[PDB]
């Protein structure tokens, strides 16, 4: 099916004190493969996948240079954005940058993206056309005009619809055993009495990949939204994910309720009921 390569950069200025803390993380779907920390002893691009450990020593040194250049540019960017927003020098600020390409079931390019942020909120984005920019405010408009004059939108489209897809197709072949997997969830129901006239019904789903899963509670096939608690898809730490949906039911009415589990790895969605 579809696939996605992604990069996440986080440049935080230490107010007390040092070089701006820089974390670079690389993913292929919901799987990490590269790592770069500024406070690390290595000072190199580090592998976090078995199919990337088989890459030449010339590769690991090129990645280190590009990521080091990206960090030092972000180091001065923090010092330029403090002027655009007329903020103090004794403040900690964050520059979160994300970009990536998409590959369809066929193999060819589908979506190209770049989203940049400052202090939680959005800053500048690269559109679906990959030729125009989207500034969040009047301060970010200066960055848009600077990137339009330098014709930086062409360097982005070159790296997104080419090379990114050329290396993502290479990554999907080098790791055709690790990434092409669709682990279906291992579901189960638990029942805990909360009151002398009401009880909680928890529906589990463990060991699934990819993280995208739908846990839906129903009462007579009718989607139960009220009296429902849902937790965010959590990592297992072994390359799989976990999720649960709980529902508060009147005691004796356990049988009326039903939990539906939808996932890529399952051929037909599950239906769990209490006995």
């Amino acid at each position: 099916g579809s696939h996605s390569m992604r990069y996440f950069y986080t440049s935080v200025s230490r107010p007390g004190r040092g070089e701006p803390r820089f974390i670079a993380v690389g993913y292929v779907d919901d799987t990490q493969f590269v790592r770069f920390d500024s406070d690390a002893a290595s000072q190199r691009m580090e592998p976090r996948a078995p199919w990337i450990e088989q890459e030449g020593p010339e590769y690991w040194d090129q990645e280190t240079r590009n990521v080091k250049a990206q960090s030092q540019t972000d180091r001065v960017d923090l010092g330029t954005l403090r002027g655009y927003y007329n903020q103090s020098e004794d403040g900690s600020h964050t520059i979160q940058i994300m970009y990536g390409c998409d590959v369809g079931p066929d193999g060819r390019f589908l979506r190209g993206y770049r989203q940049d942020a400052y202090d939680g909120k959005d800053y500048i984005a690269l559109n679906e056309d990959l030729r125009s920019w989207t500034a969040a405010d009047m301060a970010a408009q200066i960055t848009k005009r600077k990137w339009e004059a330098a014709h930086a939108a062409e360097q982005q489209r070159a790296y997104l619809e080419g090379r990114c897809v050329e290396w993502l197709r290479r990554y999907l072949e080098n790791g055709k055993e690790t990434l092409q997997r669709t682990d279906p969830p291992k579901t189960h129901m638990t029942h805990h009495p909360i009151s002398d006239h009401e009880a909680t019904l928890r529906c589990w789903a463990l060991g699934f990949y990819p993280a995208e899963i739908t846990l839906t509670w129903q009462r007579d096939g009718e989607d139960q939204t009220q009296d429902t608690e849902l937790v965010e898809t959590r990592p297992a730490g072994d390359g799989t994910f976990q999720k649960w949906a709980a529902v508060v039911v009147p005691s004796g009415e356990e049988q009326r309720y039903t939990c539906h589990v939808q996932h890529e790895g399952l051929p037909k969605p599950l239906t769990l009921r209490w006995e």
Binding site: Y7, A24, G26, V34, M45, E63, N66, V67, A69, Q70, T73, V76, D77, T80, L81, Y99, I124, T143, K146, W147, A150, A152, Q155, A158, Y159, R163, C164, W167
Partner: peptide, 9 residues
């Protein structure tokens, strides 16, 4: 492969 052409803002 990371972005090789980094632009100053």
């Amino acid at each position: 492969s990371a972005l090789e052409w980094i632009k100053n803002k």
